[PDB]
Design a protein around this ligand. Structure first.
Ligand code: 0C1
Length: 563
């Protein structure tokens, strides 16, 4: 069947759309080539519509059925809880899309009577109605990139009331089931340091390792009605409260398998028969589906000792080499099996014999040295997108601050330390905003974080070595330098000059600001300060940070206030 059908009604914006980076002094101090930075708009939505609309031809075999049954036996060990309305309301982000039923995210979080009453009625409707297709809004995503232009990604999501019901029925399932089923292959259970540890250990655990990333084209569009029902069959193995079992059954048929698409103007836009990007099960279902197809595809391909690492549609395989000519044929056999399963490739997979040359979750393993000269492995990425988005967020107030999430997740990198930390600490110090909590996303879930708490957060996630790395690889230094020239970002010597200036100001303030000056900017000086474990680090409640993925799932993970 067709991934989408269209009526001819347009994918419309709900307000004015900005596509060009503003010419602002603060963003300009970071990146001068503003014309290279763009934000996607609904103007390119038709180009994406063409790319995502296609027929799916899916053929399942014995290997797929064998793997599915193994997955179901592990899913069978799970007991999942039904969340109360209040518990599901507390997981809603403060700036989540308002309901079309007279209330917004703030009403949900305040447990307002109109919000609560409507959510309850949506819940009773899921219990009673197993068939009526649930309406969804289709929007063009507004995302920031550097030129060489991408057409906008399309987001599909149901109303706020439905999203709160999704949490009640499936939050616990999507949080606990992926690790129970996929074990060490589930990517979202790992902090970046745990992710690098797993990749390095998997790589070194093979006699002659061969690894590959597998890029499925338009993964969401490749997901069939059968894949979605197969996904529900795994969910159904959980011990579930009867209303949760009904709500999962009704959500699958009315929402997850497909449904009508409505634009911002309320016009009938089309019909979806594939994965919606803006539902709670998107990350979980995508991971499960990709893992099931890849695990079965490895057996079909005759790939030896296949270790998967899956994060939604993002896949990396490390296996035992059978020789270069044999590996190239087995990899072609893997792709052919994935294509039969309705997961054809975008980028043709290439066998790799060096772990550092593999890009998975848009990151690669790299090496630096700590204070003792000891090798430290860490994850880095091309800094183009983080810098273009950091410049956009400096010129405009955005609900999500990718720069903050990039500082947390990429803290040991040369670029997050010298540029991101230097630029934002300078601006925030001058604006008396270092202690103001900001929203950032970690594994798709939303968090409210104070930049002054970064030293303890980084120490916990990355270890004290994140504040001492030096002697970065030449390939890493070259990629950074080339990106700065391309974007017109000042050279690293300017960044070191700005860091010494902000570190001085931070130290002068005492308190948390002096901790930030000490730990975050010790790389900028010769007269190094002593870096001891931060008392605040051990006390940090990092429960929920590295459990599961929630991209598109409308999840807020910070604490709710009492009333
Ligand atoms: C796409 S996601 O919303 O599911 N999570 C991610 O963005 C995410 C972050 C991440 C980076 C910055 C801020 N915040 C984050 O969470 C992150 C990461 C490392 C490894 C994996 C990571 N992933 C998984 C992920 C990334 C991707 F490029 C595509 C798919 C995918 F699964 C090394 C350090 O940073």
């Amino acid at each position: 069947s067709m991934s989408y059908t269209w009526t001819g009604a347009l994918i419309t914006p709900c307000a004015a759309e900005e596509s060009k980076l503003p010419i602002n002094p603060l963003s300009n101090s970071l990146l001068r080539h503003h014309n290279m930075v763009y934000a996607t708009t609904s103007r390119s939505a038709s180009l994406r519509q063409k790319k995502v609309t296609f027929d799916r031809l899916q053929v399942l075999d014995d290997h797929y059925r064998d793997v599915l049954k193994e997955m179901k036996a592990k899913a069978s060990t799970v007991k999942a809880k039904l969340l109360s309305i209040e518990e599901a309301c507390k997981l809603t982000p403060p700036h989540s899309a308002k309901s079309k039923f007279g209330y917004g995210a703030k009403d949900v979080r305040n447990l307002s009577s109109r919000a609560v009453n409507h959510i309850r009625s949506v819940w009773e409707d899921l219990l009673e109605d197993t068939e009526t297709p649930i309406d969804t809004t289709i929007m063009a995503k507004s995302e920031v990139f550097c030129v060489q232009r991408k057409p906008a990604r399309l987001i599909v999501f149901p109303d706020l009331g439905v999203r709160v019901c999704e949490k009640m029925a499936l939050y616990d399932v999507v949080s606990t089931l992926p690790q129970a089923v996929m074990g060490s292959s589930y990517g979202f259970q790992y902090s970046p340091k745990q992710r690098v540890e797993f990749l390095v250990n998997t790589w070194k655990s093979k006699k002659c390792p061969m690894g590959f990333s597998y890029d499925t084209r338009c993964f969401d569009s490749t997901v069939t009605e059968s894949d979605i029902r197969v996904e529900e069959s795994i969910y159904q193995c959980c011990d579930l409260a009867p209303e949760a079992r009904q709500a999962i059954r009704s959500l699958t048929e009315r929402l997850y398998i497909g449904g009508p698409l409505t634009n911002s103007k309320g016009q009938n836009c089309g019909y979806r028969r594939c994965r919606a990007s803006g539902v709670l099960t998107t990350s979980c279902g995508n991971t499960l589906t990709c893992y099931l197809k890849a695990t079965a595809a490895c057996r079909a391909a005759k790939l030896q000792d296949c270790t998967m690492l899956v994060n939604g549609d993002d896949l990396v395989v490390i296996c035992e080499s059978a020789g270069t000519q044999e590996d190239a044929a087995a990899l072609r056999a893997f792709t052919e099996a994935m294509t039969r399963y309705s997961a054809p490739p975008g980028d043709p997979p290439q066998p790799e014999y060096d772990l550092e040359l593999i890009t998975s979750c848009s990151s690669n393993v790299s090496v630096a040295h700590d204070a003792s000269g000891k090798r430290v492995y860490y994850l880095t990425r091309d800094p183009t997108t983080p810098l273009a988005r950091a410049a956009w967020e400096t010129a405009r107030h955005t609900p999500i601050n990718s720069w903050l999430g990039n500082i947390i997740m990429y803290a040991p990198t040369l670029w997050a330390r010298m540029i991101l930390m230097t630029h934002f600490f300078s601006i925030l110090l001058a604006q008396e905003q270092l202690g103001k909590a900001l929203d950032c996303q970690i594994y798709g879930a939303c968090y409210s974080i104070e930049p002054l708490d970064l030293p303890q957060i980084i120490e916990r996630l990355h270890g004290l070595s994140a504040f001492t790395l030096h002697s970065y690889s030449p390939g890493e230094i070259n990629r950074v330098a080339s990106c700065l020239r391309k974007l017109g970002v000042p050279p690293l010597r300017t960044w070191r000059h700005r860091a010494r200036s902000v570190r001085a100001k931070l130290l002068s303030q005492g308190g948390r600001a002096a901790i930030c000056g000490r730990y975050l900017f010790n790389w900028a000086v010769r007269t190094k300060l002593k870096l001891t474990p931060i008392p605040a680090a051990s006390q940090l409640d990092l429960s929920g940070w590295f459990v599961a993925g929630y991209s598109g799932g409308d999840i807020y993970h910070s604490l709710s206030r009492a009333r």
